[PDB]
Coordinates of C-alpha atoms and ligand atoms in Angstrom, one line a residue:
Chain A
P1 CA -21.9 -8.2 -8.7
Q2 CA -21.0 -11.8 -7.8
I3 CA -19.5 -13.4 -11.0
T4 CA -19.1 -17.1 -11.5
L5 CA -16.1 -18.3 -13.5
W6 CA -17.6 -20.6 -16.1
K7 CA -17.1 -17.8 -18.6
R8 CA -14.0 -15.6 -18.7
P9 CA -14.6 -12.7 -16.2
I10 CA -14.5 -9.7 -18.7
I11 CA -15.8 -6.3 -17.8
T12 CA -15.7 -2.9 -19.5
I13 CA -13.6 -0.1 -17.9
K14 CA -13.1 3.5 -19.0
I15 CA -9.4 4.5 -19.4
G16 CA -7.8 7.5 -21.1
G17 CA -11.3 8.4 -22.3
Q18 CA -11.8 5.0 -24.0
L19 CA -14.0 2.0 -23.1
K20 CA -11.9 -1.2 -23.0
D21 CA -12.9 -4.8 -22.3
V22 CA -10.5 -6.3 -19.8
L23 CA -10.1 -9.7 -18.1
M24 CA -10.2 -9.7 -14.3
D25 CA -7.0 -11.6 -13.5
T26 CA -6.3 -12.4 -9.9
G27 CA -2.9 -14.0 -11.0
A28 CA -1.8 -10.6 -12.3
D29 CA -0.1 -8.2 -10.0
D30 CA -0.5 -5.4 -12.5
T31 CA -2.9 -4.1 -15.1
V32 CA -1.6 -4.5 -18.6
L33 CA -3.0 -3.4 -22.0
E34 CA -1.6 -3.4 -25.5
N35 CA -1.5 -0.4 -27.9
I36 CA -3.6 2.1 -25.9
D37 CA -3.2 5.9 -26.2
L38 CA -2.2 7.3 -22.8
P39 CA -0.8 10.9 -22.5
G40 CA 2.3 12.0 -20.8
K41 CA 5.6 10.5 -19.6
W42 CA 6.1 6.9 -18.5
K43 CA 9.0 4.8 -17.2
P44 CA 10.3 1.3 -18.3
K45 CA 9.2 -1.7 -16.3
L46 CA 10.1 -5.3 -16.8
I47 CA 7.3 -7.8 -15.9
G48 CA 7.6 -11.6 -15.8
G49 CA 4.9 -13.5 -17.7
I50 CA 4.4 -17.2 -18.3
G51 CA 6.7 -17.0 -21.3
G52 CA 9.4 -14.8 -19.8
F53 CA 10.2 -11.2 -18.9
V54 CA 8.8 -8.5 -21.1
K55 CA 9.5 -4.7 -21.3
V56 CA 6.4 -2.5 -20.9
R57 CA 5.7 1.2 -20.3
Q58 CA 4.5 2.2 -16.8
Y59 CA 2.0 5.0 -16.6
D60 CA 1.2 6.4 -13.1
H61 CA -1.9 8.1 -11.8
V62 CA -4.1 7.1 -14.7
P63 CA -7.8 7.9 -14.2
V64 CA -9.9 4.8 -14.7
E65 CA -13.5 4.1 -14.0
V66 CA -14.3 0.5 -13.1
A67 CA -17.6 -1.0 -11.8
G68 CA -18.7 2.6 -11.4
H69 CA -15.7 3.6 -9.2
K70 CA -13.5 6.5 -10.4
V71 CA -10.0 5.9 -9.3
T72 CA -6.4 6.6 -10.4
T73 CA -4.1 3.7 -10.9
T74 CA -0.8 2.4 -12.5
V75 CA -1.3 1.0 -16.0
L76 CA 1.3 -0.9 -17.9
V77 CA 1.3 -0.8 -21.7
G78 CA 3.0 -3.4 -23.8
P79 CA 2.8 -6.8 -25.6
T80 CA 0.1 -8.8 -23.9
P81 CA -2.2 -11.4 -25.6
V82 CA -5.1 -10.2 -23.3
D83 CA -5.8 -6.8 -21.8
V84 CA -6.1 -7.6 -18.1
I85 CA -6.9 -5.8 -14.9
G86 CA -4.7 -7.1 -12.1
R87 CA -4.8 -7.0 -8.3
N88 CA -3.5 -3.4 -8.2
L89 CA -6.9 -2.2 -9.5
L90 CA -9.1 -5.1 -8.2
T91 CA -8.1 -4.1 -4.6
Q92 CA -9.0 -0.5 -5.4
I93 CA -12.6 -1.6 -6.1
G94 CA -12.7 -4.0 -3.1
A95 CA -12.9 -7.2 -5.1
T96 CA -12.8 -10.5 -3.3
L97 CA -12.3 -14.1 -4.4
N98 CA -15.0 -16.2 -2.6
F99 CA -15.3 -20.0 -2.2
Chain B
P1 CA -14.2 -17.9 2.7
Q2 CA -13.7 -14.4 1.3
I3 CA -10.1 -13.4 0.2
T4 CA -9.1 -9.8 -0.5
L5 CA -6.6 -9.2 -3.2
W6 CA -4.0 -6.9 -1.7
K7 CA -1.9 -10.2 -1.4
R8 CA -1.5 -12.8 -4.1
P9 CA -4.1 -15.6 -3.4
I10 CA -1.9 -18.6 -2.8
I11 CA -3.5 -21.9 -1.7
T12 CA -2.0 -25.4 -1.3
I13 CA -3.2 -28.3 -3.4
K14 CA -2.6 -32.0 -3.0
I15 CA -1.7 -33.6 -6.3
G16 CA 0.4 -36.7 -7.3
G17 CA 1.1 -37.3 -3.6
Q18 CA 2.8 -33.8 -3.5
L19 CA 1.7 -30.6 -1.8
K20 CA 2.1 -27.6 -4.1
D21 CA 1.5 -23.9 -3.5
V22 CA -0.6 -22.4 -6.4
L23 CA -2.0 -19.0 -7.3
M24 CA -5.8 -18.9 -7.5
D25 CA -6.0 -17.4 -11.0
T26 CA -9.2 -16.1 -12.6
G27 CA -7.0 -15.1 -15.6
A28 CA -5.9 -18.7 -16.3
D29 CA -8.3 -20.8 -18.4
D30 CA -6.7 -24.0 -17.0
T31 CA -4.4 -25.0 -14.1
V32 CA -0.7 -25.2 -15.0
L33 CA 2.1 -26.6 -12.8
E34 CA 5.8 -26.8 -13.6
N35 CA 7.5 -29.4 -11.4
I36 CA 5.4 -32.5 -11.3
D37 CA 5.3 -36.0 -12.8
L38 CA 1.9 -37.3 -13.5
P39 CA 1.2 -40.9 -14.7
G40 CA -0.1 -42.0 -18.1
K41 CA -1.1 -40.5 -21.5
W42 CA -1.3 -36.8 -22.2
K43 CA -1.8 -34.6 -25.2
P44 CA 0.4 -31.6 -26.3
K45 CA -1.0 -28.1 -26.0
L46 CA 0.3 -24.5 -26.4
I47 CA -0.9 -21.9 -23.9
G48 CA -0.6 -18.2 -24.5
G49 CA 0.5 -15.6 -22.1
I50 CA 2.7 -12.6 -21.6
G51 CA 6.1 -13.5 -23.1
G52 CA 4.6 -15.7 -25.7
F53 CA 3.5 -19.4 -26.0
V54 CA 4.4 -22.2 -23.6
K55 CA 4.4 -25.9 -24.5
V56 CA 2.6 -28.0 -22.0
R57 CA 1.3 -31.6 -21.6
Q58 CA -2.4 -31.8 -20.9
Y59 CA -3.4 -34.5 -18.4
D60 CA -7.1 -35.3 -17.9
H61 CA -9.0 -36.6 -14.9
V62 CA -6.1 -36.0 -12.4
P63 CA -7.2 -36.5 -8.8
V64 CA -6.5 -33.4 -6.7
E65 CA -7.6 -31.9 -3.4
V66 CA -8.0 -28.1 -3.0
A67 CA -9.8 -26.1 -0.3
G68 CA -10.9 -29.4 1.2
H69 CA -12.6 -30.7 -1.9
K70 CA -11.5 -33.9 -3.7
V71 CA -12.1 -33.7 -7.5
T72 CA -10.6 -35.0 -10.7
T73 CA -9.5 -32.2 -13.0
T74 CA -7.5 -31.2 -16.1
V75 CA -3.9 -30.3 -15.3
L76 CA -1.4 -28.7 -17.7
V77 CA 2.3 -29.5 -17.0
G78 CA 5.0 -27.3 -18.4
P79 CA 7.7 -24.6 -17.7
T80 CA 5.6 -21.9 -16.0
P81 CA 7.7 -19.8 -13.6
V82 CA 4.6 -19.7 -11.2
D83 CA 2.2 -22.6 -10.6
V84 CA -1.5 -21.5 -10.9
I85 CA -4.9 -23.1 -10.7
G86 CA -7.3 -21.8 -13.4
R87 CA -11.0 -21.4 -14.0
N88 CA -11.5 -25.0 -14.8
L89 CA -10.6 -26.0 -11.2
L90 CA -12.0 -22.8 -9.6
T91 CA -15.4 -23.6 -11.1
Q92 CA -15.2 -27.1 -9.7
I93 CA -14.9 -25.7 -6.2
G94 CA -17.5 -22.9 -6.6
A95 CA -15.1 -19.9 -6.5
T96 CA -16.5 -16.5 -7.5
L97 CA -15.4 -12.9 -7.9
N98 CA -17.2 -10.3 -6.0
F99 CA -17.1 -6.5 -6.3
Ligands
017_1 C1 -2.0 -13.2 -19.1 C2 -3.2 -14.0 -18.8 C3 -4.3 -13.9 -19.8 C4 -2.9 -15.5 -18.8 N1 -1.9 -16.0 -17.7 C5 -2.5 -16.0 -16.3 C6 -2.0 -14.7 -15.6 O1 -2.8 -14.6 -14.4 C7 -0.5 -14.7 -15.2 C8 -0.1 -15.8 -14.2 C9 1.4 -15.7 -13.9 C10 1.9 -15.1 -12.8 C11 3.3 -15.0 -12.6 C12 4.2 -15.5 -13.5 C13 3.7 -16.0 -14.7 C14 2.3 -16.2 -14.9 N2 -0.1 -13.4 -14.7 C15 0.6 -12.5 -15.4 O2 1.1 -12.7 -16.5 O3 0.7 -11.4 -14.7 C16 1.6 -10.4 -15.3 C17 0.8 -9.1 -15.1 O4 1.1 -8.8 -13.7 C18 2.4 -9.3 -13.3 O5 2.3 -10.0 -12.1 C19 2.4 -11.4 -12.3 C20 3.2 -11.5 -13.6 C21 2.8 -10.3 -14.4 S1 -0.9 -17.2 -18.1 O6 0.0 -17.4 -16.9 O7 -0.2 -16.8 -19.3 C22 -1.8 -18.7 -18.4 C23 -2.3 -18.9 -19.7 C24 -3.1 -20.0 -19.9 C25 -3.3 -20.9 -18.9 N3 -4.1 -22.0 -19.0 C26 -2.8 -20.7 -17.6 C27 -2.0 -19.6 -17.4

């Protein structure tokens, strides 16, 4: 699809067996969601948001389906006011910003 | 132009007689810049992100130039660690996401 930006660019992905609505965020390096149920081990990561640096859980090799592509990706889980998919996943699906 | 996302999408904008490097950010509802003095009246706003709320000043109808287009636009000014242009300005220049 080609999406204009008058509305927030939200799409539905499948992650850890669940459908989740997520904002496509070109200013995010990483994909971050709050309070999702992902199995297995994780490591601590510190990310810097607009308000400061925040501790999150980093899950590697997570199967996601986005825009009908099935990939594996890194997913961070932690306090965020919006569940976002960042450039790590947007590049995986070949997304571009056009103008 | 068509920008892939393996890199952060950083463009220059001319504003307030300054040249600033800004992230083109589909996750930001509105542009926010840290180090800049803009003339005139403004209204206080809180914006919400990772790490909590940030207090900003909202300036309306600010002349800027980005991607070769002169427009007037809403600019938020406050202590963001990274300057971004948001969907308000991206829509004024016809930016879209494609995947
Ligand atoms: C979290 C989003 C809903 C909102 N943010 C825009 C977002 O693109 C920020 C923009 C951003 C970028 C860098 C530093 C601060 C803010 N990126 C961000 O927080 O990304 C985090 C996830 O990946 C990591 O890589 C970058 C920081 C981490 S935001 O900066 O809080 C923001 C909120 C409201 C407005 N009007 C403008 C910006």
